[PDB]
């Protein structure tokens, strides 16, 4: 498991050279945006249920056969399992956003998950659609300018969305 | 590697739960200290060569026999001087790595786990490098808490 | 599934012996109560729509904010009303399943094992459905021991 | 009890070593946040009675049946009103305890571990107290990160 | 194990009342001096060996029969054991200073230690003298005004010294 | 595990005959040179670190990419592992020299070692070069006529060098 | 096989360390005694046939019935005499093996582990070979510590 | 304690048998080497003070800062000189103990097991004592195998 | 377990002084008589059965009720057990003679043996008589001047006999 500092240190050690001014500047920018990153992580974790609810609402709205008799979640068990899956994926996205690196999300979650879903018979495309809707809802909620000090969070939003396409592409 | 952020994430993951307010407080402490850590790293990296040469000369003045006695384990000729400068460069490079990472991880992993067998085999006395690191600590030109952080890790280096 | 007959048969089979007089007495009790159980199931199934609409209206009158406040988790528009009617229909359907089976098996298996995570995620308060089931219990039109049986399982439903 | 400082000390003691720089960073985060935590605690303690009365009145206006229906579990008379004010006082008291301690420890230990059996036995619906805590959150008069901290623990309270 | 906040919260919960303005003011003062407390803890831990060396030097200077043939530490084993004991006591003092409460030092260290020392035959009075010399050396080193920002650390010095007499009185 | 006496006794027992005067003379010569053999073993073991240092110096001098960034030992771990390997091989050579037979070195060390090195990706040719440099350094140090009584140690030097080519040929 | 040198090497190897001064002292003792051991081996090997014939004749004179009674287990004819000479030759051969090796290893491994079943099956009394070895011990012509060593191993042979 | 004789006796006793020829050979090696061991011990004990003073002066000439810098861990005054002479006396005393006993036992038990914590705590660099022991090794005035034995144990002392 | 060298080293270390010339001279005399000591140990171990036989013969000659019906060894079991005991005591005496110190004989054998014999009902006085007869036989056999180089072994004989009275006094 690596974060940004650990990745930079490993890549500089394997080559045996001091850190260039570029890497120092990048890590100093990471440090400067650390407070925005903590804001994003706190807001995403403490509003996790609302994000999951919005994503599920959209997914069941555009693919209603999912919640109709004979569908792939027409019961308390499968509904709760889908919601657990969605909360898990959001939790690992919050991990990657706090770490500033996708290594934990790729290695511990996105490895072998695609095989699991097609072995279980769960349609992966609808999972990817739900993940994209999670991305939309999460970015909408993070950028909410109320109750906070005005500022630019565009880089973090881009990074979090990049994590989301990495998650969606690992099951599509 | 052993960083506070990775340790917090592993603690949160081992119990299968979202991140708690304690871990966010710890990451906040890490982010607030990383400013001084990065300032110290930048300073030590920019003035690297001056520090290397000053430390080498301090070693020569403090242990004069190292410049006089013949033998491969000494710095009586140019080859020894260059090897010693390379060694002090390795030391400074790994201390800056550790300052960047924010923990003793790089020092524990890349230097200390193998330094003892290396020094016994090639008859290199640790007090030479102790004196070099003491010079670097006394002549890094940092002030305040950034200097305090640098000195923390330098003292970690001293306990070879 | 967990029915008295299947439980008796499993008890008899685990010891590799014929059925004892105790198990036949238990099956006799099951058969004698199944008359009232089936009467209650038939009644609740025939008057399903009236009960659904009355329970929805009781919920609206008891918690008026659910008809006034905007927001997706409320029944301010037609979509919310239809979802709520569907939910109460699920509740009544599974209670009738349990009445038919003669035990808490269907309620334990198809509803209660997943209701809590569903309600937390979509911000649905259990007291809405508690009030709906209370209305259904007070307005099912059954009399005697069949009503008693229905109320037994309705109270099982209340302890969400 | 579960505080960040006690957790750091226990982590340091279990490995029989001096305190590391990571634990001092964490204690630094705790000390820097304790200013906002104590400001929020002081504010919530000073305006305690106003908040209690406003929350009680919000509960009465939101669930009007609680003022109309007879029965011991309701607030139709003075005894019910006084019990409800005492209950909301318990809630606010323990949330201020948790704000003072800097963690969920007091909430986990003094309230949540026994609230469920209490509420089932005396037929107290959790949504009453949910609405009271929502009012308190919307009307505590705090601004900035101190308010953010208060809201963090209030949301911890909401997930009853 | 309690710190100051936990002790105050427990004592207020056992009585069932909100925190009085006195306790709030005291804990706010603790918060305000937290940075001085971190300075004391860092300086005491990173200079632990020098403190132990000074204390041992003084103790062997005023009680030289300790390091003379027939004495109670005239060997590598007993010398190293005494130094280990001294480093342990200093470590637990640093714990109590960081916690702002003596509960860890009393409960986990000072309970049954006096019985241990007289059962082992180690003279407890000289241990108390060494502890007092540790107190003197530690307070001298903490108050050093060089390399730091000018300020008042008298309350912390009094508290740390109070921990030291608690330690010395538990073995005297 | 066999020494010279045990090998001769086994080979004579498998044929069922008394020892010929040739074998008796050979073993008596071994006995006569036993003191020289003890001198060689003592000097080789008590100067092991200097031998390893000289060998490593030569090897890194003629193959400098070994100690340059990207090389196969550019770190404390791989350096210490190479030195451990070298000390191990020298230790087993001292075993074989004291025993007067290569059976221990062949059976317990040189069996499967070549497979280990190519499975690990360590270049065996440079290992053989380092072994040859160990041979040169060890023979130089053993024949040092200072501090000892003058005498002929040519047979032992030849035997030890034979052990060294057996070691070098087992990994080349 | 069990020699002092192999035992020292195995002791040193089992703990993964270089050879200690104790093991070199033991090997020194082995080397100093090997001179007498080899002298005794050479002497016993050169005069082998004389010793064999003298021991056979001593056995015949001491137990005369072995030359008189008929029966396959006796030495009444030439076949018995030749078998007995072969047997005493085996004994002397293995004792010289043990003298060469410097330990009881060869005697423990090649002779004693199977001698008992052999002697019981073919009705060979051990006292015959005891007397033969006593004669060999009294008539080997060795002097001093070499003789002492030979007698040590001969007494090892006596305790059949 | 760990002597060759005690080790042989313990090996013989653990198997409940009389002493074998191997153990007597080992004790013979011990007895033959004890002559040189005792000669070296007597010589090192007689010339103790000359060696102590020469080693102290060698340390002062090799590391001149030890005579110049102020500070308690140095030999700038008479107290430091006397402490250093006492230390070198301890070293020589324990090496002579080990020479007398014939093994590394006394060095393992009375010095090495505690030297590291002592030197770290009082900031004593091991290279001082390394240089002192090197001087003693180069200036003990012994010749032959007795000198070889002394140097063996001195090199054991060097690997601090 | 101590030998002479270890005892002297311990007693000198507990006092913290170099070895006096007296102790050096004593240990040098021990070294000089080491060869006589090895002769005594070898002759006593390789003739152990004859010593035991002579001792038992004398003991049964002067106390014949031991081997008469109703006696304390009138059977194969008790006879073999007595002979085992006698061989054990002789073995530990050979240990003490090789070590040049009685510590092993006192600590591992003579501790609790007297209690064992009176708890078993074996008459300890006759055991002491048999031990004294072992002493006489062993000293007679050790001093045999045949087959050896002429020399003085009086000190060793006195020491071995001292071990014997220590053994006999531990059961009498
Ligand atoms: C919901 C968005 C979709 C879907 C979900 C669904 N899943 C199951 C079962 C499983 N889901 C997982 C996923 C994970 N388990 C982990 O530990 C992790 C990482 C930490 C992940 C990502 C697994 C392993 C299973 C199988 C084992 C289990 O159930 O725990 C079901 C039930 C299928 C069935 O009952 O036949 C469902 C329904 N269904 C949908 O319709 C959505 C597209
Ligand atoms: C980005 C998504 C949005 C945003 C971020 C933003 N916040 C500030 C204010 C701050 N928020 C924090 C966060 C924490 N402090 C803690 O102790 C904890 C854990 C309990 C957290 C999560 C901090 C430290 C600050 C700075 C101090 C303050 O109170 O203001 C800013 C301005 C200051 C800055 O960027 O450093 C910004 C930009 N603002 C937006 O507009 C985005 C939508
Ligand atoms: C300089 C302060 C003193 C000193 C230097 C010196 N070194 C050598 C050889 C080596 N130095 C190292 C150290 C490291 N290599 C690593 O990868 C790491 C981890 C970061 C460390 C700490 C090593 C391994 C060697 C041996 C292998 C090599 O040469 O690279 C010499 C030459 C000695 C010889 O050839 O025998 C010298 C002179 N000596 C002094 O006198 C200076 C005071
Ligand atoms: C009606 C009494 C109140 C209420 C209804 C409401 N529900 C939703 C959405 C959901 N209802 C359920 C319940 C179940 N589905 C099952 O399979 C089972 C087991 C038998 C149960 C108990 C679920 C899972 C959902 C979410 C998924 C879905 O839509 O099917 C809404 C919409 C809320 C939203 O979109 O966010 C509403 C309004 N709300 C009220 O106000 C009524 C009082
Ligand atoms: C007020 C918001 C609503 C409500 C209040 C009410 N409570 C009772 C009785 C009890 N309330 C509690 C709660 C607690 N006691 C504790 O120690 C803690 C931990 C901090 C809690 C959360 C309990 C235990 C009781 C029962 C025992 C007691 O009386 O103390 C009543 C009376 C009900 C009755 O007598 O049956 C009432 C009315 N009811 C409403 O209608 C208000 C909206
Ligand atoms: C040194 C200042 C004094 C003294 C010390 C001394 N101690 C021993 C042995 C022990 N010391 C302890 C103390 C502790 N062990 C713990 O775990 C803790 C708390 C975490 C403490 C405070 C103990 C338990 C022992 C006995 C077990 C052990 O040794 O580990 C000795 C050795 C005594 C001897 O060898 O006979 C000594 C010398 N001696 C002095 O002269 C100083 C006054
Ligand atoms: C009291 C013993 C002495 C003293 C204390 C003092 N320090 C400041 C400066 C600061 N020291 C810290 C400490 C830390 N920051 C970290 O991140 C860590 C862990 C890595 C530590 C240990 C801090 C935060 C400050 C304040 C910021 C700054 O750099 O100045 C002061 C003045 C400011 C204050 O008190 O808050 C004081 C008084 N000064 C003395 O004279 C005493 C001898
Ligand atoms: C140094 C001269 C060369 C070289 C060495 C190197 N080795 C490794 C790892 C291993 N070396 C061994 C060898 C042995 N282990 C034994 O037990 C024995 C006999 C008792 C032998 C001979 C083994 C088994 C390994 C693998 C397991 C281990 O490491 O302990 C490395 C590290 C490789 C890496 O980190 O990728 C190295 C570098 N490297 C050189 O450049 C020299 C040619
Ligand atoms: C051969 C590499 C070199 C050499 C050997 C040599 N040595 C002697 C001297 C002796 N060395 C020993 C060795 C030991 N005695 C012990 O007790 C121990 C273990 C602690 C050892 C290792 C011995 C016994 C002797 C003989 C007695 C003496 O002190 O002289 C000689 C001459 C005598 C002989 O060969 O037997 C020789 C030749 N000399 C060289 O020139 C080679 C370089
Ligand atoms: C001679 C001293 C007395 C004696 C000799 C005798 N032996 C046989 C037959 C056998 N002797 C042996 C002994 C060994 N064979 C081995 O390999 C070893 C290990 C070194 C030993 C000790 C054996 C095995 C036999 C039987 C098999 C064989 O013949 O080789 C005889 C013939 C007896 C018969 O045929 O029944 C004799 C006469 N008998 C005397 O009277 C001599 C005093
Ligand atoms: C002299 C070579 C250098 C040196 C000497 C020095 N020592 C001290 C104090 C101590 N020396 C020891 C060493 C031992 N004591 C033992 O019992 C043993 C086992 C045999 C050893 C190895 C110890 C334990 C101490 C501290 C306790 C004591 O004083 O006895 C000093 C004084 C340092 C101070 O007071 O802080 C000095 C000067 N220093 C030099 O500069 C010399 C080169
Ligand atoms: C013979 C000289 C005398 C005597 C002996 C006798 N002993 C027993 C039984 C025992 N003898 C021992 C002694 C030892 N066991 C040990 O391990 C050691 C040290 C290593 C010693 C010294 C013990 C323990 C026993 C009891 C257990 C056992 O038998 O092994 C008997 C048998 C008594 C009976 O059968 O009733 C005898 C006869 N008897 C004499 O007449 C002699 C005086
Ligand atoms: C004392 C009981 C009697 C006695 C002793 C004596 N022996 C010598 C001769 C020697 N005996 C040995 C012993 C051994 N060498 C070994 O390798 C082994 C184990 C296999 C042993 C047991 C030795 C080394 C000698 C010296 C060399 C030699 O062969 O002569 C002497 C004279 C020499 C001396 O004392 O050192 C003596 C006195 N002689 C008596 O009269 C006592 C009855």
Short mmCIF file of C-alpha atoms and ligand atoms in Angstrom, two decimals, chain G residues 59 66 72-75 79-80 83-84 86-88 90-91 110-111 115 118 122 124 128-129, ligand 10:
data_model
loop_
_atom_site.label_atom_id
_atom_site.label_comp_id
_atom_site.label_asym_id
_atom_site.label_seq_id
_atom_site.Cartn_x
_atom_site.Cartn_y
_atom_site.Cartn_z
CA UNK G 59 42.49 -71.14 21.58
CA UNK G 66 37.43 -77.86 20.34
CA UNK G 72 30.42 -78.84 12.52
CA UNK G 73 30.74 -76.06 15.11
CA UNK G 74 34.21 -77.28 16.09
CA UNK G 75 37.74 -77.08 14.65
CA UNK G 79 37.74 -76.57 7.46
CA UNK G 80 37.15 -75.55 11.08
CA UNK G 83 37.11 -70.75 9.39
CA UNK G 84 38.55 -69.87 12.81
CA UNK G 86 39.24 -66.23 8.99
CA UNK G 87 37.17 -65.18 12.02
CA UNK G 88 40.19 -63.98 14.01
CA UNK G 90 37.94 -60.38 10.71
CA UNK G 91 38.36 -59.37 14.36
CA UNK G 110 30.76 -53.39 11.43
CA UNK G 111 31.06 -56.02 14.20
CA UNK G 115 27.82 -60.43 16.51
CA UNK G 118 25.58 -64.69 14.65
CA UNK G 122 26.01 -70.95 14.94
CA UNK G 124 29.96 -70.07 18.77
CA UNK G 128 36.92 -68.38 22.37
CA UNK G 129 37.25 -64.95 20.75
C1 LIG J 10 37.35 -69.90 15.50
C2 LIG J 10 37.88 -68.83 16.49
C3 LIG J 10 36.32 -70.82 16.22
C4 LIG J 10 35.28 -71.20 15.33
C5 LIG J 10 35.15 -70.71 14.07
C6 LIG J 10 33.99 -71.10 13.08
N1 LIG J 10 33.16 -70.20 12.43
C7 LIG J 10 32.36 -71.00 11.67
C8 LIG J 10 31.39 -69.99 10.97
C9 LIG J 10 31.23 -68.66 11.10
N2 LIG J 10 32.08 -67.58 11.74
C10 LIG J 10 31.39 -66.27 11.55
C11 LIG J 10 31.92 -64.91 12.08
C12 LIG J 10 31.82 -63.75 11.40
N3 LIG J 10 31.47 -63.55 9.91
C13 LIG J 10 31.46 -62.03 9.64
O1 LIG J 10 31.24 -61.48 8.61
C14 LIG J 10 31.80 -61.38 10.95
C15 LIG J 10 31.91 -59.86 11.17
C16 LIG J 10 33.37 -59.40 11.00
C17 LIG J 10 32.00 -62.37 11.96
C18 LIG J 10 32.36 -62.07 13.43
C19 LIG J 10 30.10 -66.49 10.82
C20 LIG J 10 29.05 -65.44 10.41
C21 LIG J 10 30.00 -67.93 10.52
C22 LIG J 10 28.84 -68.65 9.78
C23 LIG J 10 28.83 -68.26 8.28
C24 LIG J 10 30.21 -68.57 7.67
O2 LIG J 10 30.62 -69.77 7.63
O3 LIG J 10 30.93 -67.64 7.21
C25 LIG J 10 32.66 -72.32 11.77
C26 LIG J 10 31.91 -73.47 11.04
C27 LIG J 10 30.70 -73.83 11.93
C28 LIG J 10 29.60 -74.46 11.06
O4 LIG J 10 29.81 -74.66 9.83
O5 LIG J 10 28.49 -74.76 11.58
C29 LIG J 10 33.68 -72.40 12.65
C30 LIG J 10 34.34 -73.74 13.05
N4 LIG J 10 34.90 -72.65 15.80
C31 LIG J 10 35.88 -73.19 16.55
O6 LIG J 10 35.86 -74.27 17.04
C32 LIG J 10 37.02 -72.15 16.64
C33 LIG J 10 37.52 -72.09 18.02
#
